[PDB]
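Lab intake sheet, docking and co-folding queue.

SAMPLE TYPE: protein with bound small molecule
LIGAND NAME: zinc ion
LIGAND FORMAT: SMILES
REQUESTED OUTPUT: full 3D complex as structure tokens
PRIORITY: normal
SUBMITTED BY: R.K., bench team

The fields below were copied directly from the construct record.
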Amino acid sequence: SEMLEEIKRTIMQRLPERVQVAKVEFEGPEVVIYTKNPEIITENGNLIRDIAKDIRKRIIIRSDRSVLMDPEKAIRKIHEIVPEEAKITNISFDDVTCEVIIEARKPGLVIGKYGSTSREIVKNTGWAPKILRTPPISSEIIERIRRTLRKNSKERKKILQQLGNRIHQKPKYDNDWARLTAMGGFREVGRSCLYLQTPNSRVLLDCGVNVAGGDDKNSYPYLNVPEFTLDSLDAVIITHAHLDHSGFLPYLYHYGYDGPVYCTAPTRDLMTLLQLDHIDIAHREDEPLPFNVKHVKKSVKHTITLDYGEVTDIAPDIRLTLHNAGHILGSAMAHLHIGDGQHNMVYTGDFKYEQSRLLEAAANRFPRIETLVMESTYGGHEDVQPSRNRAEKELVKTIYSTLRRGGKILIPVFAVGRAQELMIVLEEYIRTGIIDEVPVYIDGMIWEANAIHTARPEYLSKDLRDQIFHMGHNPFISDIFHKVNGMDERREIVEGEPSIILSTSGMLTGGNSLEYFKWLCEDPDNSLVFVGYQAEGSLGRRIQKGWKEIPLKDEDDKMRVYNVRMNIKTIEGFSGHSDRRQLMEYVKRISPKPEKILLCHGDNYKTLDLASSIYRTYRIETKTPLNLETVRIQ
Amino acid sequence: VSEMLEEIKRTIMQRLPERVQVAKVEFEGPEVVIYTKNPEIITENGNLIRDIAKDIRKRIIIRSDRSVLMDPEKAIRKIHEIVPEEAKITNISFDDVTCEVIIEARKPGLVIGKYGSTSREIVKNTGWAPKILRTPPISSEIIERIRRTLRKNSKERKKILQQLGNRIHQKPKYDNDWARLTAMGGFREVGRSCLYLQTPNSRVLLDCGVNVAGGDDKNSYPYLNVPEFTLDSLDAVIITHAHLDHSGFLPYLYHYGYDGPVYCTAPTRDLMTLLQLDHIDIAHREDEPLPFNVKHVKKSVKHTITLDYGEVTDIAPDIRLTLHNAGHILGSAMAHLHIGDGQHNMVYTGDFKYEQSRLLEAAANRFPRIETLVMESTYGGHEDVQPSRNRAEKELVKTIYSTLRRGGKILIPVFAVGRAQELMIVLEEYIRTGIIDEVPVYIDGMIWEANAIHTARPEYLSKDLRDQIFHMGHNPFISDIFHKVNGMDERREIVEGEPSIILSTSGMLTGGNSLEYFKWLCEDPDNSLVFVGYQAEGSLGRRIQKGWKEIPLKDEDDKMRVYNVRMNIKTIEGFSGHSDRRQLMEYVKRISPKPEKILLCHGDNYKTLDLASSIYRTYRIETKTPLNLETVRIQ
Ligand SMILES: [K+]
Ligand SMILES: [K+]
Ligand SMILES: [Zn+2]
Ligand SMILES: [Zn+2]
Ligand SMILES: [Zn+2]
Ligand SMILES: [Zn+2]
Ligand SMILES: [Zn+2]
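RESULT FIELD (auto-filled):
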């Protein structure tokens, strides 16, 4: 409140009057300078950056509300100076960031050669143009998120006002120490949740849920831990959108959390999609779910989207940076700069240290690092996956076999994960004629997630991105695929001609895939293909492990015993997690060599296995904490 | 007040005869107290009482109701009637809380009377319960001061127990799915021993010490600023032994609003308060801040509950505590915590010597069900094997007779309680025999006052020594050999005087009287210094022990002055109150039930890891060596 004034005074004393400052706000992680002279934005903020580096802050310049053009009139002036050439799809406005969102067929000519066209836009309207390429298909989810954000301007500004007020304070105490407390997904794969404590700050790294249909004592993170109180909590960071890592977030907002959430733009989008489906599933089966739609909305309002590499002040003593995890669209690793920096840490979350058809390999270059916290899903020597090539041949073989038998191939997948990777490869192999021309069916859920993909292309692999937006080969539109919604429709699918099915609930735990499974499991011609990791507990793993006598609800709700006779095939070398050797290589090749390693998100016996392996082959101390244990970082 | 309580009361009384004229049943601390209107029932060995006690697994105490207790003044009159004078009484005290009359006499057997006849009659006549004691050879200023405090706060103390008892005997709120221990001090170090046990229902501190090695606050005090620690949720504090590195921070808690109990042995409590008070006096005599005062030490006493070795006591709805002899110091204990269903119990050792000393019995190794064991590791690491004390004794005499005939004094710096006691015994015997030249040995007032407490708590001393003082009258703490030193003028007269033996307060040279004698005798080659206890990192003792000779400190007129050491520095290994490398190892072998997990504390970093490395390699038991803010899960 008072230390902030000194920050404001420093700005004004370093700035010319010509820059007509209206007010200086502390909005969230950043400092905002509002000017009554829009042309100032246009000029080089080099003097601005000189100030930013001087006070060690991020500084944004925007136009004051007074010098902003009425959106009505603002649109005319746009069409005036483009004009039709770069055919414009849509124009939107953002009352908070003072940006005009412009999506067009050819974004280049919205900008102008030396960025001169957009220069004219700001100079004439006062709006910062966000030049964006037209999405080949709109994503209902994003449209909704935008409506939420739009209609809640006033409220969002105050949240940012207050959040920023907490963030740029001088720390209350010295930074003697730092600690990490496990709260989930340790010596298990499930409720990934990690709790960082400073004498000043309390942050939660991931906040997930165990999807496996079991006890509450096994499905949720340990909030009942003495150290964790909700009021003390300064921020939640969400690596990627999988419910393993994000599913418990809406519970927090139900229990009265009032703070920020940080993640990549895709993460926020996918997250919302997955959580919303999680409501539809419970409403479908008549199961008491705690969080309503409202709690997802609150989550969205308090979410702060971050680009990869974008350094962010989230607490008086904590800078956050997100680096590409390359596991799922928008998946990220958290690098945390703590205090004086001498003891920084990195959390991986789920990651893959290999370029996929969809994503760029996980990052491995960072600022100074003391401690590394990595997943160990496929840890333990026995977990070397086969080469991408071999993995691909294997699939083709299975499908051809089924197709020749005249059957269908069911591949159960999460709405986002292996699904997209699978779609790229299948599209290609069919179109090329490596696989026989056969319809590939896809759950609305996956489809809707794909929409998000094409809409955040910057988060895809360069290779793929350029293939879509420069070469015009977009696999997700292909006539090969057919969108699926309604059990009514699905009935026809299973009764129809030999085909390939992608359906929701990655491990066969409820959802659509289960219903397909019911219909197809009793025919030896059909085959079930496993691609993702099958967690312990899940029916998927039970099936995989060889279980062939499964009891389920009937056409009505009658319990019926199902004698599985269909082919069960697991295809290794496709998972979103880096394999055993890749994990070990990731440690060999790091930015600064870490001095301590923690292992999480890993099956009990695989975690211990990797730990000794790492140490004996690299002589680096690795801790393998149990679920309620705490490790010191500083 | 509570329904769970009333239920117990009914079950108690429906199993009692009309003859037990029961006034009321109270829950007072860990125990259930039956007040009776018929004192003659106290007399009978409550065979039915103990039966009820085992059946409900609670501890039951019988007392006379305040109704049938005779006036204190009137009671005294009735007592002197029945001795009548032969067994010469020294002092008579009363305790409103326990309904107990305390009597110290020259001949206690005559106050009991054959067949307990006399004592029985005192109950019949006054309603008071006679606690009979022999009058100690020396009275303890500190023990008397405590007793006064307890008398003049009985009103409050009665209420304190009533609430505490009310909290303890409740049904556990949540299941006992998990248990965990947070290191808060004295881990990978020796300094602020403090340990935080937490269940879903209960929060207990094991030890609460101060790193006497006075430096930064961030290094001297335990880490209470850990998120998981609240003072409002803390159910109990357990103090193993009176040493400041285990007990010195306790008064801070009460300063900062702690309202709960402290558990320990009677001598521990007494010794505690002595060292705690001395620590306060030292700071104020040396113009230095300390975040607690006398006021707070008094509060600490008010809330203290003393226990005997092997006394099972309900601490929390899901915790039972038993203290076992640690053999380290007078009253030194290990803690056995029976948690929940008892499947995942733990033991904390504190400091301990797994060997019989002249002064104390060997550290207990026999316990009921255990899963986790937390032991000290001061002398971990293969290098830290100590030679037999028979050798240490011989090697000590050698040094003495050398320095003594050279025209020099022998300085031994010791904490008021510790090696001082042991040393005095072995010293007394050797001069009396004539193995040592007869020279006067000077003691600091502090060690003397500590001794007083030793002779007042006989039952905690080794069986041998207990027998030799209280049945043979060979009390070594009386020998004309020793001289109590108070004031500064006496100390100067020893330095200029003719050579002899010195014992001075503050073990490793922190300050106090210990630093005074040093700044008088170190520049003389004739003199020498002997280390007998452990030397912690942040001390001058540790520096002088490792070969360092030059130091900067203050003079008479508080002047920054140089001090050059020419004297002999001889360390006598094989006398510390900590069991050495061989004994620590042996302890793990002979431990009653084999633990399935071991945590190491109170050890030097490199030694801790060394030991742990060897524990696992030898016995293949998981050993954790947690850093100072880490948490280990027990269940
Ligand atoms: K809590
Ligand atoms: K605290
Ligand atoms: Zn995961
Ligand atoms: Zn994931
Ligand atoms: Zn490109
Ligand atoms: Zn000790
Ligand atoms: Zn100690």
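REVIEWER NOTE: Chain A has four domains: 1-63+139-168, 64-134, 177-386+579-634, 387-574.
SIGN-OFF: pending second check by T.M.
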